[PDB]
Amino acid sequence: TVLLEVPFSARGDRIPDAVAELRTREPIRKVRTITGAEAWLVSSYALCTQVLEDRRFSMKETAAAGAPRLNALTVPPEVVNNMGNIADAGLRKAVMKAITPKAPGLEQFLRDTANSLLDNLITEGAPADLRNDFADPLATALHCKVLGIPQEDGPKLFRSLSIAFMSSADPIPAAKINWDRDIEYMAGILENPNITTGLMGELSRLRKDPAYSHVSDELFATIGVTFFGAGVISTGSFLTTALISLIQRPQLRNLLHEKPELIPAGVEELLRINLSFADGLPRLATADIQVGDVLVRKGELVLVLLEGANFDPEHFPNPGSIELDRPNPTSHLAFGRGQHFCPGSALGRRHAQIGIEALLKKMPGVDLAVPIDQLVWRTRFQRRIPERLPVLW
Ligand code: HEM
Ligand SMILES: Oc1ccc(CNc2[nH]nc(-c3ccc(O)cc3)c2-c2ccc(O)cc2)cc1
């Protein structure tokens, strides 16, 4: 027989039984990626946390030429160290401050947008597609607002992402085409005097500040493109599959409908059991490092399986159950951990909370309009998502 292949399944509505067997029998073990490369798959909470909190397991070095690869690059290799570059340009604080959900009127904008989308769906009548006509438009509108760019520019940038976040064995020509075009767009945004708010407005000001005279224009455009893409794909995909998790639990749906003050904790649990990341987080060992029973050698590829950690019964008892009163509710790895912890976590949380609150208020009887098995799960993608999410109410 051949070496165990990853990923195991593109389905985001259930965790494979094989994961628990793996965690119990071999919480770090050798696998083969789609490129043919070998890697260590880590699937226990303890070892996942160990790996993510040890910077000698490097994100940046995953971009090195000749390295074993999880998948082909869809960005310039320097972009792999994007946050690092941000840090080096002295821009980390401003960027992070710009993408919090705390800006005046941001949450009200989210609510208004969600409510408008839902009103439109209700007017059009069931069935409704909660991905293409709710979650993703909401994410896109949100990130246009956050970046300070026109709403009407959102869809076209959005249309890069189905390619931008592919997980391919080979390089993707369209990915480079779209990348260069979106980069030209963001550079134009930086030169556009009308853009004075949000992330791009702030970057536009800092660009002309003498304290930043030697930061490259490339980096400025790149922040815009990368944060738009990662933010929209992450919030859209998470919200979609969270809505799936919610729909499959009518009792929770009803409870949250009755006591919306419980919605954030619910969202936190929805975060914990979320399967949106299709692959483990990649890291390259820069030294010989002991992980459980395995001595990982310098230059080897390591994959941190988030659902491995988050469904670990040793950290989250009865892991498959949504429990709103856990003693350790935010200790999941849905936003990663350590050096590369998600800078957009608060915004993602608020996006999901407001989207769910609005949905439950508008569509308290929301349910799937097709049998669960009929959902079409996107393959070889960095996220797990159903192509369409047909619902009734
Ligand atoms: C539910 C929403 C989200 C989830 C579940 C999520 C998940 C994650 C995870 C697991 C990582 C760590 C990846 C790794 O360490 O290899 C990460 C990092 C990152 N996230 Fe998110 N994210 C979300 C929303 C967002 C948003 C809203 C933005 C931006 C507006 C964003 C931008 C980024 C960026 C740029 C990184 C790279 C950090 C680094 O390289 O140090 N994400 N995210
Ligand atoms: O070896 C690797 C390679 C890539 C990655 C991150 N994955 C990723 N795939 N696609 C994009 C992307 C985003 C926007 C866009 O217009 C086109 C493509 C990104 C990305 C890049 C930098 C970030 O800071 C965030 C997300 C991690 C390890």
Side-chain angles (χ1 to χ4, degrees), residues 52 59 79-84 86 92 95 99 142-143 146-147 199 223 226-239 267 271 274 276-277 280-283 306 332-349 351-352 383:
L52 290 179
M59 167 184 295
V79 177
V80 171
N81 193 36
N82 189 26
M83 270 298 338
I86 288 160
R92 183 174 170 276
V95 165
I99 63 171
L142 172 60
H143 283 77
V146 166
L147 260 68
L199 175 60
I223 297 169
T226 56
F227 273 65
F228 180 96
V232 169
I233 203 66
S234 297
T235 54
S237 302
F238 167 65
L239 177 56
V267 165
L271 281 164
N274 154 269
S276 75
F277 274 69
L281 305 180
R283 297 292 193 267
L306 297 184
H332 58 76
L333 306 191
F335 293 117
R337 189 142 170 171
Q339 179 72 12
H340 297 282
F341 183 86
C342 183
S345 67
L347 186 62
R349 284 183 170 105
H351 171 266
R383 298 294 181 279

